């Protein structure tokens, strides 16, 4: 079980203005810690946003959280369910800020909503040092879906942080799972508006290397992987399916020659986009999320899994029998025969 903390900077805020937090299960004995980002789609105007507080209010507020959660998968204390790094300290951070981790705005008159998921990381970060992160050696920022492109937005900035704060001892890295988009053709038209309206209603921020090559207007870009990863200092493990179901859900995608063509174009995209990731995990199959499922280890590929392939990134920051680039090359869901049933 991992415990709950509300945030003690009250002014860091859910949606609603209720206090932000995070679950914690301490491992005294070990100098690693792994902070994951919960995902959650989002919302980006008034209308769209007080849908979501009517149904998926959890994602918008802390008033209804549970004191406990079970850690699964990744952030398992089991060896047998977690062979990479089940005697780390363990941090699961609640997604209530509905930005895809970017906002810093506060609630006002002006505004019906806070959006801080930007802020919120940097929050629990200054009050876990306190908790014992001070003596860390390493930072694991991980995150499934949106929490994957939340990754990709804040892992940089945290390494600022820590450097600023006077801790240059702790190696900050990312883990991105299932957050690796690509903003191309739909197979039917009902597409990047929603991001483009959102990141105006949050004042979402990203990285500032990315922002200065974009410039105004344009920062919608950094919220796709593929163009937001080369401008990163901090290392970073993609893992992706090569067949998204969110990417095919925004595709229109529910088997024809026309389908069949898009479908193995999609995945051949997909593939190039990452052949200059040299720390990445992308089998070809038809899926949504991995790292904190509690099967996330059956998964292979060319033999190797998942939580290996993480244990030999550790070792290289190329190795005899221990990869890090692993990316199918067969051009069909399920064409690996370790794909999720
Ligand atoms: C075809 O164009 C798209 C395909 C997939 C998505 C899903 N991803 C998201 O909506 C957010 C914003 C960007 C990163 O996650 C969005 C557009």
């Given at each position: 079980?991992?415990?709950?903390?509300?945030?003690?900077?009250?002014?860091?805020?859910?949606?609603?203005?209720?206090?932000?937090?995070?679950?914690?299960?301490?491992?005294?004995?070990?100098?690693?810690?792994?902070?994951?980002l919960?995902?959650?789609?989002?919302?980006?105007?008034?209308?769209?946003?007080?849908?979501?507080?009517?149904?998926?209010?959890?994602?918008?507020?802390?008033?209804?959280?549970?004191?406990?959660?079970?850690?699964?998968?990744?952030?398992?204390?089991?060896?047998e369910?977690?062979?990479?790094?089940?005697?780390?300290?363990?941090?699961?951070?609640?997604?209530?800020?509905?930005?895809?981790?970017?906002?810093?705005?506060?609630?006002?008159?002006?505004?019906?909503?806070?959006?801080?998921?930007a802020?919120?990381?940097?929050?629990?970060?200054?009050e876990?040092?306190?908790r014992?992160?001070?003596?860390?050696?390493?930072?694991?920022?991980?995150?499934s879906?949106?929490?994957?492109?939340?990754?990709?937005?804040?892992?940089?900035?945290?390494?600022?942080?820590?450097?600023?704060?006077?801790?240059?001892?702790?190696?900050?890295?990312?883990?991105?799972?299932?957050?690796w988009?690509?903003?191309?053709?739909?197979?039917?038209?009902?597409?990047?508006?929603?991001?483009?309206?959102?990141?105006?209603?949050?004042?979402?921020?990203?990285?500032?290397?990315?922002?200065?090559?974009?410039?105004e207007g344009?920062?919608?870009?950094?919220?796709?992987?593929?163009?937001?990863?080369?401008?990163?200092?901090?290392?970073?493990?993609?893992?992706?399916?090569?067949?998204?179901?969110?990417?095919?859900?925004?595709?229109?995608?529910?088997?024809?020659?026309?389908?069949?063509?898009?479908?193995?174009?999609?995945?051949?995209?997909?593939?190039?986009?990452?052949?200059?990731?040299?720390?990445?995990?992308?089998?070809?199959?038809?899926?949504?999320?991995?790292?904190?499922?509690?099967?996330?280890?059956?998964?292979?590929?060319?033999?190797?899994?998942?939580?290996?392939?993480?244990?030999?990134?550790?070792?290289?920051?190329?190795?005899?029998?221990?990869?890090?680039?692993?990316?199918?090359?067969?051009?069909?869901?399920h064409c690996?025969?370790?794909?999720?049933?």
């Amino acid at each position: 079980d991992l415990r709950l903390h509300l945030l003690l900077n009250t002014s860091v805020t859910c949606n609603d203005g209720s206090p932000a937090g995070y679950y914690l299960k301490e491992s005294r004995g070990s100098r690693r810690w792994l902070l994951f980002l919960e995902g959650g789609w989002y919302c980006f105007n008034r209308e769209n946003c007080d849908s979501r507080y009517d149904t998926m209010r959890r994602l918008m507020s802390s008033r209804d959280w549970p004191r406990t959660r079970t850690g699964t998968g990744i952030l398992s204390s089991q060896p047998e369910e977690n062979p990479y790094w089940w005697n780390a300290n363990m941090v699961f951070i609640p997604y209530c800020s509905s930005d895809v981790w970017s906002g810093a705005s506060s609630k006002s008159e002006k505004n019906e909503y806070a959006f801080m998921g930007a802020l919120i990381i940097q929050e629990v970060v200054r009050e876990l040092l306190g908790r014992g992160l001070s003596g860390a050696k390493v930072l694991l920022l991980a995150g499934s879906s949106a929490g994957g492109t939340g990754v990709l937005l804040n892992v940089d900035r945290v390494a600022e942080q820590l450097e600023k704060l006077g801790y240059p001892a702790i190696q900050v890295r990312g883990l991105a799972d299932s957050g690796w988009f690509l903003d191309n053709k739909q197979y039917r038209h009902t597409p990047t508006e929603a991001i483009r309206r959102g990141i105006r209603y949050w004042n979402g921020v990203v990285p500032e290397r990315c922002r200065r090559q974009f410039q105004e207007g344009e920062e919608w870009n950094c919220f796709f992987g593929y163009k937001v990863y080369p401008t990163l200092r901090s290392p970073v493990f993609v893992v992706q399916w090569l067949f998204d179901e969110a990417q095919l859900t925004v595709d229109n995608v529910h088997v024809q020659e026309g389908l069949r063509l898009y479908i193995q174009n999609l995945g051949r995209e997909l593939r190039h986009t990452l052949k200059d990731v040299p720390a990445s995990f992308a089998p070809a199959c038809l899926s949504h999320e991995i790292i904190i499922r509690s099967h996330w280890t059956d998964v292979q590929v060319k033999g190797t899994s998942l939580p290996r392939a993480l244990h030999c990134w550790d070792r290289s920051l190329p190795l005899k029998g221990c990869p890090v680039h692993l990316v199918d090359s067969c051009p069909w869901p399920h064409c690996n025969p370790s794909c999720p049933t």
